């Protein structure tokens, strides 16, 4: 059964991150660490939703801080660099924030009710950048990660757009940009991404077409990186689809841009340029205007690896001990835990009293809940 490490009293789980194999659980007014089977606590200010623990011991923890976003170190001391804006939201709402090589990227508004953008903050990868108006959905993102596209680091983000007039439709995308992007070709555009492209994802089966992304992660294989994307639906089902990043990178490399029929500029939109090389005026104008590939990415096997119940909140993966390239996939709903074996294709489930926020695998599955940190599978 699950070994529960309980909070003194049930908490509002606001965020969960793994850093160097240590689990950081942000709540309202505190952050908890879990490792070596011990749950420890750093209390912080109250009315302070801890949305953010990132690497920049020296772990930066940030929260709404009663409506004035603020960051601390894990020991509760104030952050010497006075980070706040862009590191925690202005209220308890969903955020996407990541750091890679100490570079921080975030969709967190940097002013209250500001325009929703995906930003890189000033740092080791270059000065601050932001997406153009409406490039990112009002809803923000559902996933973000850094991955090499051959030679260069690119940032990939997932999100579901909402469009249409007579009919409101949802559209899932993955978008790519260069981690070290130097921005636009003129002073006015110099802090805008210059390499942003997006491509539609597909996750269909038997007429069911999944659109709302819940959560995602990647898995490295011998020759590829596999992107796992869990979708929800307003119906009674959810769905997990997988994608080849090689396939996705090829599409960004070779697809034409929707609505643009002239030969693409050179160098091409969306590729990374050596430090000191700036995007050309023509490429930037085209990419700003035509940021969507004329393509749609099909999942591996052309359908979901599996369908589950709607309302799945999170999932994670653990590669099977002796069956390599096989996995156990854990996923959760508010009050239930599920696992899918990729080899057998059997799904198991159990109901729990705990209100589950996420599942994160270290050497075992950790289930983070209102009641605390649960170690190991139940049933
Ligand atoms: C948690 O507390 C124990 C002492 O009870 C300590 O050994 C351990 O270092 C602490 N863990 C973290 C990550 O602070």
Q: For the CA atoms of the chain, what is the radius of gyration?
A: 21
Vertex 91: Cα angle to 89 and 229 (nearest 5): 60
Tell me, in angstroms, the distance from the centre of ligand 1 to residue 87's CA: 26
- Are 24 and 32 in contact, with CB atoms under 8 Å apart? yes
- Here the tokens at position 102 are 């100490």
Of all protein residues, the one whose alpha carbon is nearest to atom 11 of ligand 1 is 40
Q: Please list the residues that pair with 28 across neighbouring strands.
A: 49
Query: What is the spatial distance between Cα 142 and Cα 228, in angstroms, rounded to a whole number?
Result: 12
- Domain segments of the chain as ranges: 1-379
What letters, b where the CB count within 10 A reaches 16 and e where it falls short, cover 8-22? eeebebbbbbbbeeb
Of all protein residues, the one whose alpha carbon is nearest to atom 1 of ligand 1 is 40
Query: How many angstroms separate the Cα of 288 from the Cα of each of 137, 158, 185, 271?
Result: 16, 19, 12, 14
- CB 336 near ligand 1, within 6 Å: no
Query: How many angstroms separate the Cα of 369 from the Cα of each of 33, 70, 142?
Result: 14, 25, 20
- CB 35 near ligand 1, within 6 Å: yes
Domain 1-379 has CATH 3.20.20.70: no
Ligand 1 pocket mutation, candidates 38, 55, 74, criterion most atoms within 8 A of CB: 38
Cβ neighbours of 181 (radius 10 Å): 22
- Here the tokens at position 81 are 């660099």
- Here the tokens at position 243 are 């994608």
Query: What is the spatial distance between Cα 33 and Cα 205, in angstroms, rounded to a whole number?
Result: 41
Vertex 294: Cα angle to 291 and 300 (nearest 5): 110
- CB 38 near ligand 1, within 6 Å: yes
Q: Quick one: how far is CA 211 from the chain centroid?
A: 16
Tell me, in angstroms, the distance from the centre of ligand 1 to residue 38's CA: 7
Q: Please list the residues that pair with 24 across neighbouring strands.
A: 17, 33
Query: What is the spatial distance between Cα 285 and Cα 253, in angstroms, rounded to a whole number?
Result: 18
Tell me, in angstroms, the distance from the centre of ligand 1 to residue 5's CA: 14
Query: How many angstroms separate the Cα of 104 from the Cα of each of 8, 63, 129, 159, 227?
Result: 33, 16, 11, 19, 22
Ligand 1 pocket mutation, candidates 31, 32, 36, 55, criterion most atoms within 8 A of CB: 36
Residues 6+ apart with CB under 8 A from 194: 178, 181, 182, 183, 184, 185, 278, 279, 283, 284, 287
CA-closest candidate to residue 33, choices 373, 374, 362, 356: 373
Query: What is the spatial distance between Cα 247 and Cα 351, in angstroms, rounded to a whole number?
Result: 38
Cβ neighbours of 272 (radius 10 Å): 21
CA-closest candidate to residue 127, choices 119, 135, 138: 119
SS (H, E, C) 14-40: CEEEEECCEEEEECECEEEEEECCEEE
Query: What is the spatial distance between Cα 267 and Cα 275, in angstroms, rounded to a whole number?
Result: 15
Resolution limit, Å: 2.0
Q: Please list the residues that pair with 226 across neighbouring strands.
A: 219, 244
CA-closest candidate to residue 332, choices 346, 315, 317, 319: 315
Cβ neighbours of 158 (radius 10 Å): 22
Is the peptide bond prior to 217 cis by the omega test (within 30 degrees of 0)? no
Which residue has 């706040």 as its token pair?
A: 84
Query: What is the spatial distance between Cα 98 and Cα 275, in angstroms, rounded to a whole number?
Result: 22
- CB 57 near ligand 1, within 6 Å: no
CA-closest candidate to residue 215, choices 300, 326, 94: 94
Of all protein residues, the one whose alpha carbon is nearest to atom 13 of ligand 1 is 33
Tell me, in angstroms, the distance from the centre of ligand 1 to residue 82's CA: 26
Ligand 1 pocket mutation, candidates 40, 43, 58, criterion most atoms within 8 A of CB: 40
Which residue has 């050596």 as its token pair?
A: 274
- Here the tokens at position 349 are 């489930």
Cβ neighbours of 157 (radius 10 Å): 25
Vertex 356: Cα angle to 350 and 360 (nearest 5): 90
What letters, b where the CB count within 10 A reaches 16 and e where it falls short, cover 191-203? bbbbbbbbbbbbb
Burial-class residue 280 by CB neighbours within 10 Å (0-12, 13-18, 19+): middle
Atom of ligand 1 nearest to the CA of 38: 1
- DSSP codes, 275-327: TTPPPPHHHHHHHHH--EEEEEEPPGGGS-SEEEETT--EEEEEE-SSSTT-E
- CB 40 near ligand 1, within 6 Å: yes
- CB 75 near ligand 1, within 6 Å: no
């Amino acid at each position: 059964s699950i070994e529960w490490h309980k909070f003194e009293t049930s908490e509002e789980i606001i965020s969960t991150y793994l850093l160097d194999d240590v689990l950081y659980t942000g709540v309202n007014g505190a952050v908890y660490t879990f490792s070596n089977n011990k749950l420890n606590k750093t209390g912080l200010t109250n009315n302070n939703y801890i949305t953010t623990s990132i690497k920049v011991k020296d772990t930066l923890v940030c929260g709404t801080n009663n409506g004035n976003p603020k960051c601390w170190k894990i020991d509760g001391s104030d952050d010497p660099k006075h980070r706040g804006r862009g590191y925690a939201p202005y209220q308890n709402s969903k955020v996407t924030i990541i750091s890679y090589n100490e570079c921080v990227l975030s969709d967190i508004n940097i002013s209250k009710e500001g325009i929703k953008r995906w930003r890189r903050f000033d740092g080791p990868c270059g000065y601050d950048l932001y997406t153009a108006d409406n490039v990112i959905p009002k809803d923000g993102l559902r996933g973000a990660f850094v991955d090499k596209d051959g030679t260069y680091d690119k940032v990939y983000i997932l999100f579901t757009d909402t469009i249409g007039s007579k009919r409101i439709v949802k559209i899932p995308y993955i978008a790519q940009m260069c981690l070290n992007d130097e921005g636009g070709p003129s002073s006015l555009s110099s802090h805008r991404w210059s390499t942003f492209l997006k491509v539609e994802l597909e996750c269909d089966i038997d007429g069911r077409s999944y659109r709302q992304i819940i959560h995602s992660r990647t898995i490295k294989t011998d020759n590829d990186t596999i992107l796992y994307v869990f979708f929800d639906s307003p119906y009674s089902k959810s769905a997990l689809c997988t994608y080849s990043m090689n396939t996705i990178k090829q599409s960004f490399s070779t697809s034409k841009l929707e609505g643009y029929t002239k030969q693409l500029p050179s160098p091409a939109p969306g590729i990374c340029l050596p430090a000191g090389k700036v995007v050309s005026h023509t490429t930037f104008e085209v990419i700003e205007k035509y940021n969507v590939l004329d393509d749609i990415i099909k999942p591996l096997s052309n359908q979901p690896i599996f369908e589950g119940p709607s309302g799945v909140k999170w999932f994670d993966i653990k590669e099977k001990e002796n069956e390599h390239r096989e996995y156990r996939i854990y996923f959760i709903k508010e009050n239930s835990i599920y696992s899918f074996d990729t080899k057998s294709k059997q799904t198991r489930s159990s109901q729990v009293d705990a209100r589950l926020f996420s599942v994160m695998v270290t050497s075992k599955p950790l289930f983070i809940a209102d009641i605390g940190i649960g170690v190991g599978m139940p049933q």
